[PDB]
Amino acid sequence: VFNNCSEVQIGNYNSLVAPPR
Amino acid sequence: VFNNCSEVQIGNYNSLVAPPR
Amino acid sequence: VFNNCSEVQIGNYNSLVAPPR
Amino acid sequence: VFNNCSEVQIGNYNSLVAPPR
Amino acid sequence: VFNNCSEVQIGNYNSLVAPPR
Numbered sequence: 001v002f003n004n005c006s007e008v009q010i011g012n013y014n015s016l017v018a019p020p021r
Numbered sequence: 022v023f024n025n026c027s028e029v030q031i032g033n034y035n036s037l038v039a040p041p042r
Numbered sequence: 043v044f045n046n047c048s049e050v051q052i053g054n055y056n057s058l059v060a061p062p063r
Numbered sequence: 064v065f066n067n068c069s070e071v072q073i074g075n076y077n078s079l080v081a082p083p084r
Numbered sequence: 085v086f087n088n089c090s091e092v093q094i095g096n097y098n099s100l101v102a103p104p105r
Contacts, residue, residue: 005048005069006026011035014053018061018082019039026048039061047069047090056074060082060103068090077095081103 001010022031043052064073085094 001022001031001052002044003024003029003031003050004026004046005050006028007048007050007069008024008026008029008045009035009051010022010031010043010045010053011033012054012056013034014032014056015036016056016058017038018059019041020062021042028048043064043073045066045071047067047071049069049071049090050066051072051074052064052066053074053077055076056072057078059080062082063084064094065086066092067088068092070090071087071092073085073087073094075096075098077093077098079098079100081101083104
């Protein structure tokens with residue numbers, strides 16, 4: 001688990017739902 | 022678990038819901 | 043699990059749903 | 064599991080649904 | 085599992101559905 005730059009996400013079972021229109 | 026730049030998130034089972042319109 | 047640049051995501055069972063129109 | 068450039072994703076059983084129109 | 089350039093994805097059973105019109 002290592003992040004150098006921005007906009008990075010680490011995590012198991014990390015669900016993500018985008019914004020519906 | 023290491024974060025260098027900004028906009029970084031680390032965590033297991035970290036669910037995320039975007040803003041619905 | 044190593045991220046160098048931005049816009050990178052690591053995680054097993056990490057489902058992702060895009061924003062429906 | 065190694066990512067160098069951006070726009071990279073590593074994770075088993077990582078389903079992805081595109082945004083329907 | 086090694087990614088050098090961008091737009092790369094590694095993961096078994098990683099289903100992907102394109103956006104229907």
